[PDB]
Amino acid sequence: EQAPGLSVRFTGINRSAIASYLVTLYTSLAVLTDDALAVLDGVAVDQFHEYQ
Amino acid sequence: PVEAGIYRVNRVVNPDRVAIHSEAGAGTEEPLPETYVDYETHPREYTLRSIST
3-state secondary structure chain B: CCCCCEEEECCEECHHHCCCCCCCCCCCCCCCCCCCCEECCCCEEEECCCCCC
Task: Please report the sign of the dihedral spanned by the C-alpha atoms of residue B52, residue B43, residue B18, residue A15.
Answer: negative
CB contact under 8 A, A17 and B32: yes
> Which residues in chain B have Cβ-Cβ distances shorter than 8 Å to A16?
29-32
Assess A19–B contact: CB distance below 8 Å, yes or no: no
Q: Yes or no: say if A7 and A1 are a contact pair by the CB < 8 Å rule.
A: yes
Q: Yes or no: say if A11 and A21 are a contact pair by the CB < 8 Å rule.
A: yes
Nearest CA in chain B to A14: B31
Containing B13, the helix (H) or strand (E) segment is strand B12-13
CB contact under 8 A, B29 and A16: yes
Q: Yes or no: say if A11 and A22 are a contact pair by the CB < 8 Å rule.
A: yes
B20, B21, B32: which to substitute to probe chain A, counting the most A Cβ within 10 Å? B32
Secondary structure E strands in A2-47: 6-13, 19-25
CA proximity to B23, closest of A48, A32, A17, A6: A17
Q: Yes or no: say if B39 and B13 are a contact pair by the CB < 8 Å rule.
A: yes
Q: Structure resolution in Å?
A: 2.6
Q: Yes or no: say if B35 and B19 are a contact pair by the CB < 8 Å rule.
A: yes
Assess B9–A contact: CB distance below 8 Å, yes or no: no
What experimental approach yielded this model? cryo-EM
CA proximity to A19, closest of A5, A30, A9: A9
Q: Yes or no: say if B7 and B33 are a contact pair by the CB < 8 Å rule.
A: no
Exposed, middle or buried by CB within 10 Å (0-12, 13-18, 19+), for B10? exposed
* CA triple A24-A27-A33, angle to 5 deg: 175
From CA B17, how far away is CA B43, in angstroms rounded? 19
